[PDB]
Design a protein around this nucleic acid. Structure first.
Ligand SMILES: Nc1ncnc2c1ncn2[C@@H]1O[C@H](CSCC[C@H](N)C(=O)O)[C@@H](O)[C@H]1O
Ligand SMILES: Nc1ncnc2c1ncn2[C@@H]1O[C@H](CSCC[C@H](N)C(=O)O)[C@@H](O)[C@H]1O
Lengths: 375, 230, 375, 231
RNA sequence: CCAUGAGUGUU
RNA sequence: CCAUGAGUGUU
RNA sequence: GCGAUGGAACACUCAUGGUAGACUC
RNA sequence: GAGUCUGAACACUCAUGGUCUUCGC
């Protein structure tokens, strides 16, 4: 009976054949119209639409946005939805002129000048809202934390080669990078090593014995203090990086408990945030089926196999989940499919703000993994 | 150094000869002294032109591979799906000039952040941070257009293009559709994909006009020109 | 006519048919024998050999190591060199018994016990001498500097993405990473930016007003102080890394001026050390032809073009030389060939400690470059 | 995985271990009980410790799996090992030849000999020589002549280096095990051509070809040739 | 991994 | 880049 | 072997899409 | 559209080789 048109222009009521029945023009306010476009996206009718229908008292209203149908029905109207109707094309083909007739704009230039500021303002607001989503902070943080891990390993490999020129035996004696960098930072010249100074740093007596024995037998070269100091710059940097790594990990814990507590209950904050990073957002993660979640991070292996026909990957980044990588190869598929199943549930509960069930998801999984290990 | 700039066979698309023998496509700059993506600004007989890199712009590539007729000319109204950071739509804005209109749809906020810089200086460009799958989310801003230009990485890109045409493309208007084969199905041969997507189009009442392979300007890309019959 | 055998066990004089004419047995001293073995590979005869030959008064002496011929001649003997002589094979096939006959060892087990300790001490002293080479230090330092460069870039790219959530327009306004990191470190919330604080850091008025204007109108999100502090941890690490980079580059200048001054005169300490790093050592670098030096660092392109017949690379890491990478592509080949040719000469001057000609090599090269560009 | 049994094979002091997963793996008797070299598994069976021998990391184990008919490295054997690297394969050679055998290990990269030195410190069997195989006049003052010359060096002229070391140190009628590394000789050529060219050079230097074994898949672009030195 | 868009470092 | 040897990090 | 000439230096960051095989309902 | 089952997660460091074409002497 009546076709409702909602546009920057205002609200316009049309017949079956395209004749304007009546209209209410929007104010020429950028703030007001953007707010109403944002509202209208979640189905809220323009306030100009509410005044229009109250005046036109229509028998049946055809709208163009499906989410708007319940909103108008709750006002007491008979409402149907119609996509790309003939009438709304007829309306769109009569712009910019119809904006002059209904007196939103004085001429074509005036109309398009306003429309241009409108699109900018609309876009700026949708950019601000996207930037407010707090899952972006978890994602950047865990990406930075992974950069730091990689850097710690890169610099520690370099320091071991560089310092082994002066004390090569230490490399194989100290497996822990942070301890190795501690020894190089604190002492430099292997001649400065002693029981008390090593004890003071927290080494136990057997370890201290192996170290002082190696330092005394050492086949390494004699280098200068300046040479040692170039090496200690790397060691100190490594120590600083571990401190940042631990801060970032504590930061990430608080954000992930806030942003995705159910996922965090299952996999912890770091691995939870890596799932977000690869998905791109919590909302994206919560659309994925378990079988996609299962291989997030394995895109190289998956597409290599999808081409060559070779063997597909059993797991992506969730391989970091201890019960996956510390179990035998033949159990890993099944465990990864059990975890992916609970991740998919946890992500939906988090994305829709459902009630926290993460601890129960964990129990269900631990017990399901127990079933599997009987293999 | 610039020997000469003369208009090519297509309205508001120019060609510049350089003394080292080179030839490059260019458009008259709507916003003199400002570049968009580091392209060279060319001055000739008072007028400033922007060189139009065909390795970065599918429309420039299509022209250098033999695009016969170009529906994008002065005063054209364009719905641009996949506006991205502004590279190709900035030249579209040059060609169409102040009385044409380029409605730019792009759903990635990270890249619309850059597109907004381009749009701010061009009263020609209306950026719409929106998902092309849902033309209901920007029908309130746009109008009906002469040209629908679609370059979105989606597996149902052709269906999305067709859906926007039913909303917004005038009958007897034109569609320039980029077919991104590795984004439709990476396992299939692009030649098959091109055949399949054009079939869709002709089934949706789009008269095929010309199909252009974009190699070497783009690997595994074609671009289709069709007239929408209604 | 005597075949001189020099072995761990001592010096043996053999006649032409494998019969022992006389011998002098080394002392059972690991340190002494090891030192005499090291001198001997350099042609210096054993002290036992000197004693032996005076006893035997040979008419002619055949030696096993050619480097020894001039040294024994300087003692007044007629001397020749024979590779893998029959007599020396007869000596070696009579071990370990001959070691018992000349009373170097009590029995087989005694001989091999000592031989084993000898081989360890010999190998230990060569390992020490290898580690003492000064070029090892330049190679490690420039490698750690390149990790640092890579890391600075990786963290800066991440910081920009991260801080852009809060202040997105700053990314395009500040192109230098150290300045971007400085702004994030100092201020955090873009609200805290004032004219005079920015002046303090050295920015100029035009830039400062663009920054403050962008911060007022920013569409970035509002985030907590704790969110900003996580970002600032990456910023301050970036600034520490730039300081390390500069200290390392100053260290590398000292080492390279001492280790390869002629190479350093042509390409600077950092690029010169990269050449050492890829070649593996100054000694290896000085064996290479110009055409190989020209493409050090481009092994990927080189072997791709060998295996496919394609176009080979024109330059490797020397692409970093400013006259190459700031020049039009049609000149780079010629330019790189001219530089590689001077580097080959320079590497040999440094490796064999010739007189410094780096200033002159550099003058020759820059004249050649002027000739090329004026085609 | 659990060991069913370990039985001696055709070749002396090389054993084959059986696992209940139906898989078999070569192993040797550990000359130094309770120590590993490169993380290999220590296997206890009927009171004797064995070391699993991974054919993917050892050319000699791989050759046995790919059908080596006779093995000159037995107990008491004297061997010159060119390319001893960090000690993977030579540690097993050490187990096979036992305390009365001798393995002289030549390796010229100090970075890797740092590691070889640790293997040798525990094995009186093994005499590590940081030395260039092109310069046998260096280590002639330490070694002796040998029954087996084992050569695994990445050098374009590895075969000529093997032949030249043989004239110094390999007994007449002794044996040479020469790994042919096709990609370190010439990446542009087909490995099968490399092998015929290298074997031809050996036969031209009075080496009698006993067996030529292609080492795929334990090592790609690799052959190994067992030859008898005629003098 | 592939294709596409935008960019950074050694400079 | 290819082949070979030895290792590291997310663990 | 020498020369001239020809000639694809490397290291990375973000954004979009492409997500398997069997059997069961 | 569900389900079960099968099933190649990523990121890196060091060591040894393999270094073109053409045209001239
Ligand atoms: N459903 C969708 N709605 C809007 N944009 C989409 C989309 N799906 C993909 N895109 C966008 O399509 C773009 C493909 S890149 C296209 C480049 C651009 N046409 C130019 O002129 O240079 C990406 O920016 C991507 O974010
Ligand atoms: N000229 C030479 N002299 C001594 N060793 C050499 C050499 N040329 C190459 N090599 C060494 O040969 C080795 C090849 S890797 C060999 C691995 C070892 N044989 C094993 O199976 O465990 C490298 O360590 C290399 O340093």
């Amino acid at each position: 009976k009546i076709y409702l048109i909602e546009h920057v222009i205002g609200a316009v009521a049309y017949d079956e054949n395209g004749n304007i029945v009546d209209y209410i023009t929007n104010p020429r306010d950028l703030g007001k119209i953007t707010e109403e476009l944002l509202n209208n996206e979640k189905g809220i009718p323009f306030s100009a639409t509410v005044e229009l229908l109250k005046k036109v008292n229509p028998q049946e209203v055809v709208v163009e946005n499906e989410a708007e149908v319940p909103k108008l029905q709750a006002l007491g109207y008979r409402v149907s939805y119609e996509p790309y109707s003939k009438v709304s094309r007829i309306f769109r083909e009569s712009l910019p002129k119809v904006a002059i007739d209904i007196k939103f704009a004085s001429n074509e230039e005036d109309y398009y000048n306003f429309l241009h500021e409108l699109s900018l303002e609309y876009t700026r607001r949708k950019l601000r809202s996207a930037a407010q989503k707090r899952d972006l902070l978890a994602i950047q943080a865990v990406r930075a934390m992974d950069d730091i891990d990689k850097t710690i390993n890169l610099f520690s490999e370099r320091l071991r080669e560089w310092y082994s020129i002066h004390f090569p035996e230490l490399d194989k004696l100290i497996e822990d990078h942070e301890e190795y960098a501690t020894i190089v930072s604190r002492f430099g010249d292997r001649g400065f090593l002693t029981i008390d100074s090593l004890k003071e740093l927290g080494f136990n007596e057997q370890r201290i014995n192996r170290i002082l024995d190696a330092a005394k037998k050492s086949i390494g070269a004699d280098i200068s203090e300046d040479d040692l100091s170039a090496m200690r710059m790397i060691a100190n940097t490594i120590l600083d990086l571990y401190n940042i790594r631990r801060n970032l990990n504590n930061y990430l814990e608080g954000v992930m408990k806030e942003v995705a507590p159910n996922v965090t209950a299952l996999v912890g904050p770091a691995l939870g945030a890596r799932l977000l990073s690869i998905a791109g957002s919590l909302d994206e993660l919560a659309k994925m089926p378990a079988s996609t979640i299962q291989v997030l991070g394995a895109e190289k292996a998956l597409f290599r196999a999808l081409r060559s026909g070779g063997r597909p990957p059993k797991h992506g980044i969730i391989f970091q989940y201890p019960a996956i990588h510390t179990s035998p190869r033949w159990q890993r598929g099944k465990i990864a499919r059990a975890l992916a199943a609970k991740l998919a549930i946890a992500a939906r509960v988090d994305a829709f703000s459902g009630r926290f069930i993460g601890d129960q998801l964990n129990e269900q999984l631990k017990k399901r993994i127990d079933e599997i290990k009987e293999k | 150094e610039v020997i000469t700039v003369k208009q090519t066979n297509m309205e508001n698309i120019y060609e510049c000869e350089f003394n080292d023998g080179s030839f490059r496509l260019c458009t008259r700059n709507l916003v003199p002294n400002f570049n968009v993506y580091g392209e060279r600004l060319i001055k000739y007989e008072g007028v400033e032109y922007r060189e139009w890199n065909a390795f970065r712009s599918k429309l420039a590539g299509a022209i250098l591979k033999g695009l016969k007729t170009n529906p994008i000319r002065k005063g054209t109204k364009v719905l641009y799906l996949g506006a991205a950071s502004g590279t190709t739509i900035s030249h579209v804005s040059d060609i169409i000039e102040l009385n044409g209109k380029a409605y730019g749809v792009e759903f990635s906020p990270r890249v619309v952040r850059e597109l907004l810089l381009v749009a701010q200086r061009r009263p020609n460009i209306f950026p719409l941070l929106a998902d092309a799958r849902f033309p209901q989310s920007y029908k309130s801003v746009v109008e009906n257009v002469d040209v629908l230009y679609v370059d979105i990485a989606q597996p149902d890109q052709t269906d999305i293009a067709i859906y926007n045409a039913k909303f917004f493309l005038k009958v007897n208007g034109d569609m320039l559709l980029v077919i991104k084969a590795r984004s439709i199905d990476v396992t299939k041969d692009p030649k098959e994909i091109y055949k399949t997507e054009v079939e869709k189009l002709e089934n949706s009442n789009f008269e095929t006009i010309q199909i252009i392979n974009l190699d070497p300007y783009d690997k595994d890309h074609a671009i289709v020109l069709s007239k929408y019959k209604g």
